[PDB]
Amino acid sequence: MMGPVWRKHYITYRINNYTPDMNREDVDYAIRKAFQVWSNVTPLKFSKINTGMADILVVFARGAHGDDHAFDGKGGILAHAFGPGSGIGGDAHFDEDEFWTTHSGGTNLFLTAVHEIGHSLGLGHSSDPKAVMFPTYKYVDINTFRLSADDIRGIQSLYGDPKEN
Ligand SMILES: [Ca+2]
């Protein structure tokens, strides 16, 4: 049996609040590129909103932060998201007790965002260590990063593929 999927292809997101670890512009870029990774291999279209309320709310929070799952300080769980649904549904939370970066020190925001957004869209983990949904964090360069076949197969078993033209 499968978890719930989004039942719409236009999905909005809003950045709740910004970590202080990085330039604001880099936060915006990383989340954006991360939605884009999944846009690239489905029909889904994501758009940022600054006011109102959105499907996927992106949050930086430490400790207990108001849902069913408290963060565990620095290290441990880096972040978590919730599968498609209303409300908390689809949201992504990043543990402020990490140090989020654009590089291979601390924890790389773009690559964790890709993994959390995977969950946002309905994916679970992968047993393939090449998949971005593998539950262990490893750095790879952003220019070079690609989804695995396994990641691709799982997202597209959910939303199908693109779609021209
Ligand atoms: Ca939501």
Ligand SMILES: [Ca+2]
């Ligand atoms: Ca943690």
Ligand SMILES: [Ca+2]
């Ligand atoms: Ca931090």
Ligand SMILES: [Zn+2]
């Ligand atoms: Zn949370």
Ligand SMILES: [Zn+2]
């Ligand atoms: Zn995960």
